[PDB]
Design an enzyme around this catalytic site. Structure first.
Site, short mmCIF file in Angstrom:
data_model
loop_
_atom_site.label_atom_id
_atom_site.label_comp_id
_atom_site.label_asym_id
_atom_site.label_seq_id
_atom_site.Cartn_x
_atom_site.Cartn_y
_atom_site.Cartn_z
N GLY A 1 2.62 6.62 8.67
CA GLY A 1 4.04 6.72 8.46
C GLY A 1 4.88 5.56 9.01
O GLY A 1 5.99 5.41 8.65
N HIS B 1 0.82 -1.24 0.00
CA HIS B 1 0.00 0.00 0.00
C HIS B 1 0.84 1.28 0.00
O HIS B 1 0.38 2.33 -0.44
CB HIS B 1 -1.05 0.02 1.14
CG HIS B 1 -0.56 0.59 2.44
ND1 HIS B 1 -0.34 -0.19 3.56
CD2 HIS B 1 -0.31 1.87 2.82
CE1 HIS B 1 0.06 0.57 4.56
NE2 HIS B 1 0.09 1.83 4.14
N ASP C 1 -0.76 -7.25 2.03
CA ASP C 1 -0.07 -5.99 2.08
C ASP C 1 1.42 -6.23 2.34
O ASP C 1 1.93 -6.02 3.45
CB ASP C 1 -0.71 -5.08 3.14
CG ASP C 1 -0.35 -3.62 2.95
OD1 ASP C 1 0.21 -3.27 1.90
OD2 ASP C 1 -0.65 -2.82 3.86
C1 LIG Z 1 -8.86 7.68 12.07
O1 LIG Z 1 -7.80 8.08 11.20
C2 LIG Z 1 -6.74 7.28 10.87
N1 LIG Z 1 -6.90 6.04 10.34
C3 LIG Z 1 -5.83 5.29 10.02
C4 LIG Z 1 -4.53 5.78 10.22
C5 LIG Z 1 -3.38 4.91 9.87
N2 LIG Z 1 -3.12 4.01 10.84
C6 LIG Z 1 -2.11 3.11 10.75
C7 LIG Z 1 -1.91 2.15 11.87
O2 LIG Z 1 -0.94 1.41 11.86
N3 LIG Z 1 -2.87 2.15 12.81
C8 LIG Z 1 -2.85 1.49 13.97
N4 LIG Z 1 -1.86 0.78 14.28
N5 LIG Z 1 -3.90 1.58 14.76
C9 LIG Z 1 -1.33 3.09 9.60
N6 LIG Z 1 -0.33 2.19 9.46
N7 LIG Z 1 -1.59 3.98 8.62
C10 LIG Z 1 -2.60 4.91 8.68
N8 LIG Z 1 -2.73 5.78 7.55
C11 LIG Z 1 -3.75 6.84 7.43
C12 LIG Z 1 -4.26 7.04 6.00
C13 LIG Z 1 -4.85 5.77 5.40
C14 LIG Z 1 -3.94 4.54 5.42
C15 LIG Z 1 -2.46 4.88 5.26
C16 LIG Z 1 -1.79 5.62 6.42
C17 LIG Z 1 -4.39 7.05 10.78
O3 LIG Z 1 -3.15 7.61 11.02
C18 LIG Z 1 -3.02 8.98 11.41
N9 LIG Z 1 -5.50 7.77 11.09
#
Ligand SMILES: COc1ncc(-c2nc(C(=O)NC(=N)N)c(N)nc2N2CCCCCC2)c(OC)n1
Length: 245
Positions: free
Chosen positions: A196, A46, A97
């Site tokens: 990130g 991804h 993924d």
């Molecule tokens: C509610 O909002 C939200 N949802 C998803 C993410 C997000 N989370 C993770 C992650 O690892 N989450 C976790 N361990 N609980 C991860 N590895 N990556 C995340 N992206 C956010 C954008 C969509 C997916 C790619 C990056 C986020 O980060 C600020 N914020």
């Protein structure tokens, strides 16, 4: 990484920092990865699916800071970028993924192991730790879900493996989580991976040795109650990894 502690690359010397070159000249951070052999870094599909051109990417090993050079670091081009053919993404979940990056330097070389640069062992087939096992996660991801900036200094934290049964509960993720994923979280939900940190290592002690058990993949927010981090279950992809390397 939400919570946890700042660290340096000596602690997690397999950690790879992956950046993308922009049309224009600027370079931004993409995702983490793990060095599994001198020429191969493993990460998450991804991270790359929107810009699947290998020539756009730069990989660093031995790097402890996001936007400054670490003494002893090595920089690589991506010779091959291998994304999983069965990748799919739902509103939340990313299936299959997993991604492989063959690295090579401007001068045609692979990684040279050092104090700051080492490979991580892969698990044996279908062999994971028991639930409740403490594993370590590492990355340059956000320190708070609401942050705009990423931390300058590398971080790591501890999370505990959650059983597949616990993870599939409806108030958690229901069926979003499959047997090719692993869930991990803090008992207080106080520390977690975040945006990130994708592509980075979840490392557990297996057969008495640090082992790449998972790859940071997804979750619903970060460090939120009943919403664990979800990781690609590396022990279910060994034929794919062995074949593509
Ligand atoms: C509610 O909002 C939200 N949802 C998803 C993410 C997000 N989370 C993770 C992650 O690892 N989450 C976790 N361990 N609980 C991860 N590895 N990556 C995340 N992206 C956010 C954008 C969509 C997916 C790619 C990056 C986020 O980060 C600020 N914020």
């Amino acid at each position: 990484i939400i919570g946890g502690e700042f660290t340096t690359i000596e602690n997690q010397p397999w950690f790879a920092a992956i950046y993308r070159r922009h049309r224009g000249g600027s370079v931004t951070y993409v995702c983490g990865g793990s060095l599994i052999s001198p020429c191969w870094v493993i990460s998450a599909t991804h991270c790359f699916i929107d810009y699947p051109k290998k020539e756009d990417y730069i990989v660093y090993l031995g790097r402890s800071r996001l936007n400054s050079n670490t003494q002893g670091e090595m920089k690589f081009e991506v010779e091959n970028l291998i994304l999983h053919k069965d990748y799919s993404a739902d509103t939340l979940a990313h299936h299959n993924d997993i991604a492989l990056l063959k690295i090579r330097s401007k001068e045609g070389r692979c990684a040279q192991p050092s104090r700051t640069i080492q490979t991580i062992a892969l698990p044996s087939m279908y062999n994971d730790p028991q639930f409740g096992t403490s594993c370590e996660i590492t990355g340059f991801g956000k320190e708070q879900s609401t942050d705009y900036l990423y931390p300058e200094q590398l971080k790591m934290t501890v999370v505990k493996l959650i059983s597949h049964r616990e993870c599939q509960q409806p108030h958690y993720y229901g069926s979003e989580v499959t047997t090719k994923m692993l869930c991990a979280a803090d008992p207080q939900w106080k520390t977690d991976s975040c945006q990130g940190d994708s592509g980075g290592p979840l490392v557990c002690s297996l057969q008495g040795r640090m082992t790449l058990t998972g790859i940071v993949s997804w979750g619903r927010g970060c460090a939120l109650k009943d919403k664990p981090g979800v990781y690609t279950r590396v022990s279910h992809f060994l034929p794919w990894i062995r074949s593509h390397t």
